[PDB]
């Protein structure tokens, strides 16, 4: 029913993110604060200023983003914005299973920043890449992927909505992927990454992280979240690891989460966290559904105000 929580991710970072909440509301500096122990660092800095640069370094921009999902989350939640159903793009997946309780927000944070480390340091600077795949469906990307895999590793990384999906590999064979789109009328842009996530090259990320996740205590979810690897919810049978395994090497397949929490009932997404990206993919999968975004005082009063037209509207 009624709301879906999306949690920002990697792309959406920037200087002085969190700041507005953090200045506003006590849950929210109180969040930084915790942020800060957890991970011995100066985490205000981090986000506030970026002092060292090191804000688009994935190591750090993870905890980064995942330490501002929360911050906002906290303050909304004592606003009284509830929901029980929600999902992320990559990272965001994290946000999400702290929102459900699996995963302690200090665990959260130290274990993405090892997981961003991982992601970034397993492929060598120059080998691998990624490229935006658009107005192709994903039948004619794996007819693209086909005739590319002979040149070197190509797979499909994300399924964002219709006509928009990344695909990553060895840039060798993405050079290749990119000439045969081009030729069946499709557009290919080379992203501007140096690294082949979401694909089998990330083999040893995903078993770095593994050992990693191992180490800490996972609970129960609480209300459902949705697997990128799967497509849709987590059961209470699945392995949780496996799945948070297999995420940094397998499809993103945001779209069909969107599409289950839809199935599911969610007619009203609010995006929380830094920036609007998947605002925009919802948008694109379905034109009907409300769709809203807090990351900083304006976006939150917009929200707000959107969700206080809707329970006076059920006040009948």
């Known amino acids: 029913a009624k709301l879906g929580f999306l949690f920002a991710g990697q792309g959406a970072q920037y200087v002085g993110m969190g700041k507005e909440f953090f200045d506003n509301f006590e849950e929210s500096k109180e969040v930084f604060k915790r ?45 009284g914005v509830k929901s029980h159903i929600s999902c992320g793009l990559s990272l965001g997946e994290y946000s999400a299973l702290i929102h459900s309780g699996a995963i302690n927000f200090e665990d959260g944070v130290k274990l993405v920043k090892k997981r961003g480390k991982f992601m970034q340091e397993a492929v060598a600077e120059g080998i691998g890449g990624m490229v935006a795949v658009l107005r192709m469906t994903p039948e004619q990307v794996d007819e693209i992927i086909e005739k590319s895999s002979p040149y070197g590793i190509v797979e499909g990384a994300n399924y964002n909505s219709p006509g928009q999906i990344v695909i990553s590999g060895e840039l060798v064979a993405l050079e290749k992927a990119m000439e045969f789109i081009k030729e069946v009328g499709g557009r290919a842009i080379k992203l501007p990454v140096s690294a082949p996530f979401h694909c089998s090259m990330l083999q040893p990320a995903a078993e770095k992280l593994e ?65 609007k990206a998947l605002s925009g993919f919802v948008k694109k999968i379905n034109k009907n559904v409300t769709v809203l975004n807090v990351e900083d005082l304006k976006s939150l009063e917009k929200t707000l105000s959107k969700l206080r037209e809707m329970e006076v509207l059920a006040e009948n």
């Open 35 to 79: 942020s800060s122990e957890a991970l011995g660092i100066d985490m205000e800095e981090l986000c506030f200023n970026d002092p060292e640069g090191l804000l688009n370094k994935t190591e750090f921009t993870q905890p980064a983003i995942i330490t501002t999902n929360m911050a906002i989350l906290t303050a909304l939640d004592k606003l």
């Open 211 to 275: 050992d990693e996740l191992n180490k800490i205590s996972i609970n129960k979810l609480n209300g459902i979240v949705m697997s990128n690897v799967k497509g849709e919810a987590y059961l209470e049978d699945d392995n949780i690891i496996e799945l948070l395994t297999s995420q940094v090497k397998k499809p993103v397949l945001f779209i069909n989460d969107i599409e289950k929490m839809i199935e599911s009932g969610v007619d009203t997404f609010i995006e929380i966290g830094p920036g």
